[PDB]
Amino acid sequence: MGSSQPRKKIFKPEELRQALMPTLEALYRQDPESLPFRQPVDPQLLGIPDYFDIVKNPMDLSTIKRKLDTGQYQEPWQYVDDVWLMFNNAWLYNRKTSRVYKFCSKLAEVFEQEIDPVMQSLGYCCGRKYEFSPQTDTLDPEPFVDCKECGRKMHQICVLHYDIIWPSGFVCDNCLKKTGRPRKENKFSAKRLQTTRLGNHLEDRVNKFLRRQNHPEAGEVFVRVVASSDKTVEVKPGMKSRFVDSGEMSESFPYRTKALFAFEEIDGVDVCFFGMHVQEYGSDCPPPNTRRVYISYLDSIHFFRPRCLCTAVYHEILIGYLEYVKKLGYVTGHIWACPPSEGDDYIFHCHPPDQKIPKPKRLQEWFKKMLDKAFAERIINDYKDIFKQANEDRLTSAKELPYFEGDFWPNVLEESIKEKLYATMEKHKEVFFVIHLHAGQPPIVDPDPLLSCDLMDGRDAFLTLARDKHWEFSSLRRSKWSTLCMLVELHTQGQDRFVYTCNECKHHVETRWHCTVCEDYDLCINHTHKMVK
Numbered sequence: 001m002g003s004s005q006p007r008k009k010i011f012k013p014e015e016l017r018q019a020l021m022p023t024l025e026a027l028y029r030q031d032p033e034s035l036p037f038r039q040p041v042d043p044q045l046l047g048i049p050d051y052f053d054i055v056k057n058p059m060d061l062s063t064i065k066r067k068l069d070t071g072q073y074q075e076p077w078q079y080v081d082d083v084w085l086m087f088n089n090a091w092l093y094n095r096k097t098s099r100v101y102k103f104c105s106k107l108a109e110v111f112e113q114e115i116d117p118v119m120q121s122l123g124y125c126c127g128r129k130y131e132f133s134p135q136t137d138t139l140d141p142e143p144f145v146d147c148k149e150c151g152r153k154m155h156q157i158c159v160l161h162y163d164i165i166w167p168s169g170f171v172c173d174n175c176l177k178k179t180g181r182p183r184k185e186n187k188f189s190a191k192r193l194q195t196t197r198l199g200n201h202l203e204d205r206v207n208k209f210l211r212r213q214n215h216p217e218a219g220e221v222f223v224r225v226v227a228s229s230d231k232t233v234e235v236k237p238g239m240k241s242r243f244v245d246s247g248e249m250s251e252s253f254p255y256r257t258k259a260l261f262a263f264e265e266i267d268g269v270d271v272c273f274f275g276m277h278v279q280e281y282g283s284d285c286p287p288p289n290t291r292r293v294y295i296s297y298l299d300s301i302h303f304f305r306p307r308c309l310c311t312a313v314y315h316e317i318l319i320g321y322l323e324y325v326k327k328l329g330y331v332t333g334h335i336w337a338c339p340p341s342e343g344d345d346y347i348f349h350c351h352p353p354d355q356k357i358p359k360p361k362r363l364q365e366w367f368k369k370m371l372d373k374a375f376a377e378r379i380i381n382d383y384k385d386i387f388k389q390a391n392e393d394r395l396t397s398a399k400e401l402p403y404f405e406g407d408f409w410p411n412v413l414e415e416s417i418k419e420k421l422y423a424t425m426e427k428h429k430e431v432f433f434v435i436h437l438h439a440g441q442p443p444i445v446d447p448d449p450l451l452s453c454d455l456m457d458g459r460d461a462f463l464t465l466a467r468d469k470h471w472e473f474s475s476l477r478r479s480k481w482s483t484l485c486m487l488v489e490l491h492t493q494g495q496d497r498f499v500y501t502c503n504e505c506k507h508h509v510e511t512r513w514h515c516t517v518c519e520d521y522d523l524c525i526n527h528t529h530k531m532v533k
């Protein structure tokens with residue numbers, strides 16, 4: 001097997017000895033923490049015969065020092081990988097409450113502290129040994145790319161290189177300043193996903209708000225509707241035969257589902273921090289579902305900058321959605337407030353281990369405070385829970401309460417099969433909401449076109465793809481990377497591909513004169529703004 005790269009970077013052994021030794025030096029000054037590591041583990045003095053069955057590749061400061069002093073490391077990544085193996089042997093063998101498990105953890109604290117800057121000034125990205133979180137002995141490792149002009153291996157996630165965007169391979173930042181070239185634009189941005197009237201409304205609401213209270217670190221927000229499609233919820237068999245042969249209510253119930261996502265710019269790159277999936281039941285839907293919206297589910301990653309404003313803008317998103325559907329025809333929404341189960345993630349693949357998922361009362365009062373802001377906001381004219389809304393809007397049978405896809409009531413009515421029910425309504429009353437947009441006739445019209453995009457049809461597609469491809473949202477850097485790859489997924493697996501149209505003639509034109517500041521204004525030659533060809 002024969003390989004090449006004609007002007008690689010190799011480090012003279014005294015070079016990387018001089019660069020790396022201060023970091024080992026640090027590890028060594030940690031007394032006593034470093035003491036069980038200055039020499040190899042001797043199971044004869046410790047009385048642990050099983051050790052070399054558990055730890056197959058021992059490593060210790062003295063071995064790394066000997067390797068360093070005799071130039072056995074040709075690239076700093078081998079140095080780094082050796083000391084991480086030492087730490088990983090420490091963590092693997094000893095219980096997480098061990099004394100030397102703790103020692104190990106502190107040594108790792110300070111080796112992280114020291115290795116990032118030196119590795120950086122040796123051209124590389126960090127000095128970390130990274131691994132993806134497990135699924136279902138093995139772990140999958142983080143990916144690397146090798147710079148094309150210098151050969152310095154770097155964490156793909158760290159430097160955010162994706163071949164599909166820059167198909168000529170990867171070249172580092174320094175190898176570019178060395179050639180005076182600037183970086184090539186990521187066209188596959190959140191901003192440049194298809195913009196749409198709904199998403200524009202939400203993003204305008206929160207952008208004005210975060211200007212209103214402006215922390216200097218907050219960045220631009222982009223809301224975007226990434227899929228939209230006409231589905232119908234089929235009525236479950238028992239529940240169906242007691243009311244459809246009757247003819248009281250319909251076989252199916254037609255709605256439009258929309259998946260919509262929010263991105264913030266953080267360190268100059270989009271970081272997708274919020275997602276939502278709604279079912280909207282139009283004016284032509286047979287009752288009970290007529291003119292109702294329902295948020296099928298919500299999800300969030302807490303890396304919004306600044307975490308102070310986090311919740312305020314989650315709320316401004318939700319209430320902007322209520323405002324928008326209000327304005328064009330719907331009259332009641334519905335927020336079943338159910339906490340994320342198990343280790344089940346709603347919309348985003350792998351959540352940050354330090355992001356606490358609420359218990360239902362936290363959840364219920366969060367929804368309640370968002371709703372209160374909406375009431376005060378002139379926007380929603382009232383709201384109350386499902387029980388006090390089912391007996392105030394007096395109701396005697398089951399085909400009278402909305403019947404949504406994947407909702408709880410459909411399934412519990414279904415299993416009330418062997419017949420009580422009217423009373424379970426207010427056991428779970430504070431988790432199910434009812435939301436009145438109007439106080440109080442012309443039909444709904446959705447300006448926004450359909451967006452066929454299977455990855456965002458429902459929620460299983462995107463989670464599955466992300467679990468495969470390891471797009472986790474567990475780190476700000478992993479989130480950055482997963483946002484990147486998800487955006488080029490949305491951009492290049494456009495199940496819609498466009499039949500452009502000009503705007504003064506409503507024609508269908510191959511060559512057109514786009515406008516720069518209009519959101520989509522083209523003109524077939526055959527006007528105010530600066531048009532470009």
Ligand SMILES: CC(=O)N[C@H](CCCCNC(=O)CSCCNC(=O)CCNC(=O)[C@H](O)C(C)(C)COP(=O)(O)OP(=O)(O)OC[C@H]1O[C@@H](n2cnc3c(N)ncnc32)[C@H](O)[C@@H]1OP(=O)(O)O)C(N)=O
Binds near residue numbers: 298301336338363
């Ligand atoms: C059968 C089946 O599967 N069926 C289902 C059917 C679908 C159900 C449909 N229903 C829904 O869609 C219901 S709404 C969506 C529920 N899902 C989630 O919420 C996902 C995870 N959570 C979040 O994204 C967020 O919490 C969010 C609610 C979006 C906003 O959070 P936040 O940032 O505004 O504040 P915080 O998180 O409440 O907490 C804010 C403070 O609370 C703290 N905190 C939170 N939780 C806890 C806790 N448990 N213990 C202690 N402290 C705790 C936290 O430290 C923090 O502190 P600080 O502000 O000082 O830093 C299926 N289809 O899978």
Ligand SMILES: [Zn+2]
Binds near residue numbers: 128154155
């Ligand atoms: Zn790195």
Ligand SMILES: [Zn+2]
Binds near residue numbers: 171
């Ligand atoms: Zn380079």
Ligand SMILES: [Zn+2]
Binds near residue numbers: 505
């Ligand atoms: Zn024309």
Ligand SMILES: [Zn+2]
Binds near residue numbers: 515518528
């Ligand atoms: Zn224009």
